[PDB]
Amino acid sequence: VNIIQDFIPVGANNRPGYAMTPLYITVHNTANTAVGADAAAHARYLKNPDTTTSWHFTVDDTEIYQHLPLNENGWHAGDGNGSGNRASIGIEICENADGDFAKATANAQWLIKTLMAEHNISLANVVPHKYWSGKECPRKLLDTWDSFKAGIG
Ligand SMILES: [Cl-]
Ligand SMILES: [Zn+2]
């Protein structure tokens, strides 16, 4: 799958820029079913000066956009300065109506497998946003989380 880099500008409110050596991979679901709410759209949204949340990769059924370098943290896990925000790579999976969720999930599993090998991160350390904050996210993968992970391998 193609990865397009379009970083949030340095110094922005949602680009804290703390050095990070990722030990985890945190999975999210955008909860945005609107037609057109794809990876490129999120890339554009994240660059708005007033946004405060941020993660590393947004995945849709066609491509993947990277908003942050992997040596920097993002604000997405909701655990302050805990490992979610300060020691994990955040990934968002789109739910846009004009996209195939099954194929977006497959693309995300490919990305996660690649990240695991390149950053020496174990499958056990691939966690849902919920793990860090108890929030019901990734809403479409929670009830079948273990299966989603079995599909990574
Ligand atoms: Cl979230
Ligand atoms: Zn989340």
Side-chain angles (χ1 to χ4, degrees):
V1 187
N2 205 295
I3 294 78
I4 294 75
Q5 300 185 314
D6 184 31
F7 295 177
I8 290 166
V10 169
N13 285 167
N14 67 161
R15 181 165 177 181
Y18 287 114
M20 175 181 86
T21 293
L23 304 175
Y24 304 90
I25 293 174
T26 303
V27 182
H28 306 257
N29 276 174
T30 65
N32 192 337
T33 56
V35 60
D38 63 14
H42 281 76
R44 185 172 71 271
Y45 165 76
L46 287 176
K47 297 205 291 187
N48 270 313
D50 29 52
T51 63
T52 49
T53 291
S54 67
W55 53 93
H56 310 267
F57 294 107
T58 298
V59 185
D60 63 39
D61 69 347
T62 305
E63 48 192 25
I64 299 170
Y65 268 72
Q66 194 187 330
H67 320 286
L68 261 23
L70 304 192
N71 50 51
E72 280 181 32
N73 79 298
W75 292 138
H76 59 90
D79 66 336
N81 280 150
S83 298
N85 281 332
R86 302 292 295 279
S88 86
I89 299 173
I91 298 77
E92 276 279 12
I93 299 179
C94 297
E95 298 180 46
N96 53 304
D98 52 325
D100 190 321
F101 192 67
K103 183 132 64 180
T105 293
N107 292 333
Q109 292 172 308
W110 165 77
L111 172 62
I112 293 172
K113 170 217 278 287
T114 305
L115 256 27
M116 285 164 72
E118 306 187 315
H119 299 280
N120 193 48
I121 297 175
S122 73
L123 181 72
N125 279 27
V126 176
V127 302
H129 177 182
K130 184 175 182 178
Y131 181 70
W132 307 117
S133 63
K135 183 171 294 178
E136 229 56 48
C137 175
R139 69 175 197 175
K140 299 199 65 174
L141 272 33
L142 283 171
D143 286 316
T144 56
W145 183 246
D146 288 346
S147 297
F148 165 70
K149 291 183 64 177
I152 297 176

